[PDB]
Amino acid sequence: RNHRLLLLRHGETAWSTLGRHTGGTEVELTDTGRTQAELAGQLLGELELDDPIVICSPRRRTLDTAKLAGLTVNEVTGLLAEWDYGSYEGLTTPQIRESEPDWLVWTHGCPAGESVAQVNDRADSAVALALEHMSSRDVLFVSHGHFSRAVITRWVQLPLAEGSRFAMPTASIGICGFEHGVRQLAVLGLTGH
Amino acid sequence: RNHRLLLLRHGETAWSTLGRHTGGTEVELTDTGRTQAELAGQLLGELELDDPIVICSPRRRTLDTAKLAGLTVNEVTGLLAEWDYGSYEGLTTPQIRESEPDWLVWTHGCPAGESVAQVNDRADSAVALALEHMSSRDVLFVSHGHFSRAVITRWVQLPLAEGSRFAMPTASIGICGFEHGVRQLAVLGLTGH
């Protein structure tokens, strides 16, 4: 296709800096988070996007980022919500490690939350959504760390387990496109701050 | 580990702009290529690298890029040479398509040149090389499009066939590291021009 799928992770929060897993919890962006968002929109500005359709996660930290980035949101949907961490909500990876030493959200999932299968499907639906609009315009997802990686991993048609192989820091941008007929990851870890 | 593996593709040449596959052929950087290289070194400057060991491909376009980027090369080795295209040297993907409609270097390889297996092994040796120095410092490979992708694909422990899923434009930087014990791709398609 002649278009792209861009993904933007929301800025920093008090929880992200501590490595805490935040799903449905409504945490606010820090002042550093607001600045990150502001710089990202600055960066999106020179990406020369074609009449972009912006889809955003319902969380306030992502809605806030979109506004601060100077974007106008077209669709707000839980489809882009972060991985539901269930019982692990608020826990860091080490803390989770004290009980499940080999844990990775990518292979284990979360007890009382979303399983890999469920996110795999949610990720595919998201990619399907993107492809429909990319027929005429560029697409931008303002979402979260793990889910954004989920989308990317699926864009490149790999098992969701591979989400562990791609970073996605706060206020960072990843870009998906094509090369000689193949869906490909073009940019990752792009930061304007 | 506490260190990173960075990869830098050489700047633009008269052949790259045309989408021609260049392996052993000694093509020069265009003036645009020299500028790209110059900007990349500018970009490497703010990456705060730890006493970096720089390994470079023997081709003149890569040696030139390193010099223009303001880098001092520690090791020059064919280990980082581009995929040997054999019979396809000089051909574009469409041209190759006129004979092998479903061709991708990643799955087919090149007749009279390197096979996937051979590049898979060369890529792994390169990763092995990096890990040995990353024990005390950061590593920088100045190489080519397909091979750099090969190294990245292997860094993340995927079959070489997946090299098709990662872009690597001229004068672009990719960065490999770790996240909670897992080898991961941190940055891709980073451009200073």
Element (H, E) at B43: helix B31-45
Distance CA A116, CA B28 (A): 48
Can you give the resolution of this entry in Å?
A: 2.2
Please list every residue in chain B whose beta carbon sits closer than 8 Å to the beta carbon of residue A188. Answer: 185-189
Question: Hey, how many other C-beta atoms are within 10 angstroms of the C-beta on A179?
Answer: 16
Distance CA A174, CA B188 (A): 9
| Coil, helix or strand at residue B81 | coil
* CB-based contact B133:B139 (threshold 8 Å): yes
* CB-based contact B138:B52 (threshold 8 Å): yes
DSSP B100-112: -TT--HHHH--TT
Look at B179 and A164 and tell me if their CB atoms are within 8 Å.
yes
Alpha helix positions (H), B56-115? 60-68, 93-97, 105-108
Interface probe with B: pick from A6, A157, A188, most Cβ of B within 10 Å: A188
Distance CA A50, CA A52 (A): 5
Q: In Å, how far is B21's CA from the nearest CA of chain A?
A: 14
Please list every residue in chain A whose beta carbon sits closer than 8 Å to the beta carbon of residue B104. Answer: 180, 182
Q: How many A×B Cβ pairs under 8 Å? A: 67
Residue given tokens 């970073």 in the structure block: A167
For residue A142, list its beta bridge partners. A8, A56
Please list every residue in chain B whose beta carbon sits closer than 8 Å to the beta carbon of residue A182. Answer: 104, 164-165
Query: How many residues are there in chain B?
Result: 193
**A53-56: strand order across its sheet:** A75-76, A53-56, A139-143, A5-9, A173-179, A182-190, B182-191, B172-179, B5-9, B139-143, B53-56, B75-76
Distance CA B157, CA A48 (A): 34
Element (H, E) at A35: helix A31-45
Please list every residue in chain B whose beta carbon sits closer than 8 Å to the beta carbon of residue A158. Answer: 158, 162, 165
Backbone angles phi, psi at B96, to 5 degrees: -65, -35
Look at B189 and A175 and tell me if their CB atoms are within 8 Å.
yes
> What are the helix and strand counts (H, E) for chain B?
6, 6
Distance CA B147, CA B62 (A): 13
* CB-based contact B184:A166 (threshold 8 Å): yes
Please give the C-alpha separations between residue A77 and each of A51, A143, B100, in angstroms, as whole numbers.
20, 10, 43
Distance CA A62, CA B176 (A): 27
Q: What are all long-range contacts of A84-88, with beta carbons under 8 Å and residues at least 24 apart? A: A84/A23, A84/A24, A84/A110, A84/A113, A84/A114, A85/A21, A85/A22, A85/A23, A85/A110, A85/A113, A85/A114, A86/A23, A86/A110, A86/A111, A86/A112, A86/A113, A86/A114, A87/A111, A87/A112, A87/A113, A88/A21, A88/A113
Phi-psi domain of B155 (left: phi exceeds 0; alpha: psi -120 through 50; beta: other): alpha
**Pairing state between β A5-9 and A173-179:** antiparallel
Distance CA B94, CA B116 (A): 20
Reading the block at residue A119, the tokens are 């996110």
Partner-chain residue, chosen from A180, A182, A185, that has the shortest CB–CB distance to B188: A185
Please list every residue in chain A whose beta carbon sits closer than 8 Å to the beta carbon of residue B180. Answer: 93, 104
User: What DSSP character marks residue A176?
Assistant: E
* Domain topology for B1-193: Rossmann fold (3.40.50)
Distance CA A175, CA A63 (A): 20
Q: In Å, how far is B37's CA from the nearest CA of chain A?
A: 19
Task: Confirm whether B10 is a catalytic residue.
Answer: yes
DSSP A125-147: HHHHHHHHHTTTS-EEEEE-HHH
Catalytic pick among B3, B21, B82, B144? B82
Q: Which of B173, B187, B174, B185 is nearest to B41 (CA)?
A: B173
Partner-chain residue, chosen from B166, B175, B183, that has the shortest CB–CB distance to A184: B166
* CB-based contact B55:B80 (threshold 8 Å): yes
User: What DSSP character marks residue A62?
Assistant: H
Q: In Å, how far is A175's CA from the nearest CA of chain B?
A: 9
B137 exposed, middle or buried (CB, 10 Å; 0-12, 13-18, 19+)? Answer: middle
Q: What residues of chain A have any CB closer than 8 angstroms to a CB in chain B?
A: 93, 104, 156-158, 162, 164-167, 175, 177, 179-180, 182-190
Task: Confirm whether B3 is a catalytic residue.
Answer: no
